Design a binder for this molecule. Structure first.
Ligand SMILES: *[C@@H]1O[C@H](CO[C@@H]2O[C@@H](C)[C@@H](O)[C@@H](O)[C@@H]2O)[C@@H](O[C@@H]2O[C@H](CO)[C@@H](O)[C@H](O)[C@H]2NC(C)=O)[C@H](O)[C@H]1NC(C)=O
Ligand SMILES: [Ca+2]
Ligand SMILES: [Ca+2]
Lengths: 4, 298, 299, 64, 4
């Protein structure tokens, strides 16, 4: 997943 | 004059029966041998020249691994001990249940025999070693790759353990009758390979030293015992192939006696055949466990 | 009670008879023991066997005549030594070299750099085991001179549904470049292009930061990702991490498929996911990554 | 004498066949177990040397 | 063992  | 034919008749009738039982047992085993035992050993992905390279490559569990000492010969199966003394040990000989015959001729001992490993009960890989002799050609090629050390481990039927460590170990090829050489000993089992039976003196002790000996099998006499009688060969008497001298202080590939303790009247030829290591338990005690492993020496 | 002296003659012979009888029976038993011996020499029969046919890769092998899928030895041109692999051969003469496989979570994929470089897990003739072939081998297979390869990804959920994702000109760089993953383009597949990244709605650049083309490989003990943190370490795996991922085939094997934020220690999605086919919170039941020369993929 | 000689021989033969057998019993036990690593199964069994040892001290007696 |  994306890790903002 | 008194009771005699009484006792003499009793024993003979008893033995008659014993023969009946043995014939039964042997007859039953022959039927079981119409089909073989089996195993399913999935092959680990990691491979290397030997177990030491494999452990340095991440193979950290003791099980069957495929190794390829050199691009010369094809890869082959071996059991790697990745837990004993920092792991990286390539097992070349293993005894633990008498499940494999070791009284074999020159060629089998040359090619290797037995079972490298068996299934870990419910697993797809073989994480348990079996009994086997890696193979003289193979053991030789492995030791000539570079300095090699040898670790010999044993255990009696009570659970006691002792080890014989050799910092240097080499085995020449077939042309040199797989001549053995070891040095730099240390351990708790006593240096039987270099110094001989610690329970003998002078000439008697010296003739039991293995260091420097050629390898002998019952069909190939290269022992340090000169005789004219074809039955007086260390391998024919002490069972199996080994670097016999005249004859031994250690008999790792001897006959597997259940229970440990055995005597001259049980032995096929009266000699002390059997998984013997005199420097620790004497001549008439057969180890429950016995193994030989190697690793590159640093 | 001790019989007459005239009995000693008959009694003495009776023993001499059975004694000799015993002897003959022994000589015959010893013989039978000899015959038994010749039957107990062979080792147990191992069911897993390796085929003889060898070559540069599974396709080169399938070209030489091999028909059944199983364990084979291949040795790419630059390879210093041959190694074992699992080949998949269909009825069309196609030989795929499988380099990754998940199917039961029996193998821990939280390995280090060396382990991912050399490979871990087990190879089976029935293709029923989990494993990672090894970055170096993958690198060697996909970078052979003038042979462009393709990567096929196969997924399967816990409902029997399977999907695939193809990638043309699949390549894996050398250790010097941290086994960087690259490819020419998505070649199609009902599994969706997870390598192109996925808009997670987290930011205006979720797409870019979860794309894998061009990403180097990463493990907890060797961080080469585009994140100030350590993707490989947080998700506990080895992979071509960005910041962090849209497709994570080497993640924690979640039994059942469905898992959640609470399932993890940190809270991040670390399962065997592929965002274009299932939610980041749906770990696959079966996974397989295989390669083959591109010219072999449908004309 | 006549029958005293036939009996001398039987004591030497029975004493030898007891040792011979005690050995075959061991040989068989070892050989059967060495099949466990080759054949489908190895016949489960156990050796009772006692019955051989007792019959030996029992014989040595009457011989005296 | 030995063989004196
Ligand atoms: C070398 O060994 C031989 C063989 O004897 C056996 O091994 C001994 C170490 C000891 O354990 C003995 O009890 C074993 O029987 C010895 O042979 C001797 O031979 C002479 C004549 O041939 C005989 O009179 C002796 O009785 C034998 N030994 C004895 C005292 O039993 C030999 O003496 C041993 N020499 C050494 C180096 O100790
Ligand atoms: Ca000789
Ligand atoms: Ca980072």
């Amino acid at each position: 997943g994306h890790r903002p | 004059i008194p009771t005699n034919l009484r006792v003499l008749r009793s024993i003979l009738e008893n033995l008659r029966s014993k023969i009946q039982k043995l014939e039964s047992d042997v007859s039953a085993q022959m039927e079981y041998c119409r089909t073989p035992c089996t195993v399913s050993c999935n092959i680990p992905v990691v491979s290397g020249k030997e177990c030491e390279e494999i452990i340095r490559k991440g193979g950290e569990t003791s099980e069957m691994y495929l190794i390829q000492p050199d691009s010369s010969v094809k890869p082959y199966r071996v059991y790697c001990d990745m837990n004993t003394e920092n792991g990286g040990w390539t097992v070349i000989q293993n005894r633990q249940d008498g499940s494999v015959d070791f009284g074999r001729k020159w060629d089998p001992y040359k090619q290797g025999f037995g079972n490298v490993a068996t299934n870990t009960d419910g697993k797809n890989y073989c994480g348990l070693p079996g009994e086997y002799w890696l193979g003289n050609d193979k053991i030789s090629q492995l030791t000539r790759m570079g300095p090699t050390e040898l670790l010999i481990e044993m255990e009696d039927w009570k659970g006691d353990k002792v080890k014989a460590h050799y910092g240097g170990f080499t085995v020449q090829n077939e042309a040199n009758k797989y001549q053995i050489s070891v040095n730099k000993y240390r351990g708790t089992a006593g240096n039987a390979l270099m110094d001989g039976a610690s329970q003998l003196m002078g000439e008697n002790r010296t003739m039991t030293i293995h260091n420097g000996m050629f390898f002998s099998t019952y069909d190939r006499d290269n022992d340090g015992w000169l005789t004219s009688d074809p039955r007086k060969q260390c391998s024919k008497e002490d069972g199996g192939g080994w670097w016999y001298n005249r004859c031994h202080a250690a008999n790792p590939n001897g006959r597997y006696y259940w229970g440990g303790q055995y005597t001259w009247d049980m032995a096929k030829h009266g000699t002390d055949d059997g998984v013997v290591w005199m420097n620790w338990k004497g001549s008439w005690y057969s180890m429950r466990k016995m193994s030989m492993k190697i690793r590159p020496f640093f | 009670y001790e019989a007459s002296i005239l009995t000693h003659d008959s009694s003495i012979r009776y023993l001499q008879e059975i004694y000799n009888s015993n002897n003959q029976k022994i000589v015959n038993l010893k013989e039978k023991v000899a015959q038994l011996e010749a039957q107990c020499q062979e080792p147990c029969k191992d069911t897993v066997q390796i085929h003889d046919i060898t070559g540069k890769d599974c396709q080169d092998i399938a070209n030489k005549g091999a028909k059944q899928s199983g364990l084979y030895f291949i040795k790419p041109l630059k390879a210093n030594q041959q190694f074992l692999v699992y080949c998949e051969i269909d009825g069309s003469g196609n030989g795929w070299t499988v380099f990754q496989k998940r199917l039961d979570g029996s193998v821990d994929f939280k390995k280090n750099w060396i382990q991912y470089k050399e490979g871990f897990g087990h190879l089976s003739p029935t293709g029923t085991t989990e494993f990672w072939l090894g970055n170096e081998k993958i690198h060697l297979i996909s970078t052979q001179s003038a042979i462009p390869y393709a990567l096929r990804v196969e997924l399967e959920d816990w409902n029997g549904r399977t999907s695939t994702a193809d990638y043309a000109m699949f390549k894996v760089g050398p250790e010097a470049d941290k086994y960087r993953l690259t490819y020419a383009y998505f070649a199609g597949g009902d599994a969706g292009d997870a390598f192109d990244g996925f808009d997670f709605g987290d930011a205006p650049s979720a797409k870019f930061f979860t794309s894998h083309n061009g990403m180097q490989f990463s493990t907890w003990d060797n961080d080469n990702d585009k994140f100030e943190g350590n993707c490989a370490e947080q998700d506990g795996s080895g992979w071509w991490m960005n910041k962090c991922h849209a497709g994570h085939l080497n993640g924690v094997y979640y039994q059942g498929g469905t898992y959640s934020k609470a399932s993890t220690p940190n809270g991040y999605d670390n399962g065997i996911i592929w965002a274009t086919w299932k939610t980041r919170w749906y770990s696959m039941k079966k996974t397989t990554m295989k390669i083959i020369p591109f010219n072999r993929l449908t004309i | 004498i006549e029958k005293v000689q036939h009996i001398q021989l039987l004591q030497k033969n029975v004493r030898a066949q007891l040792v011979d057998m005690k050995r075959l019993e061991v040989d068989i036990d070892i050989k059967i177990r060495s099949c466990r690593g080759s054949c489908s199964r190895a016949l489960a069994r156990e050796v009772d040397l006692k019955d051989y040892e007792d019959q030996q001290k029992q014989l040595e007696q009457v011989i005296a």
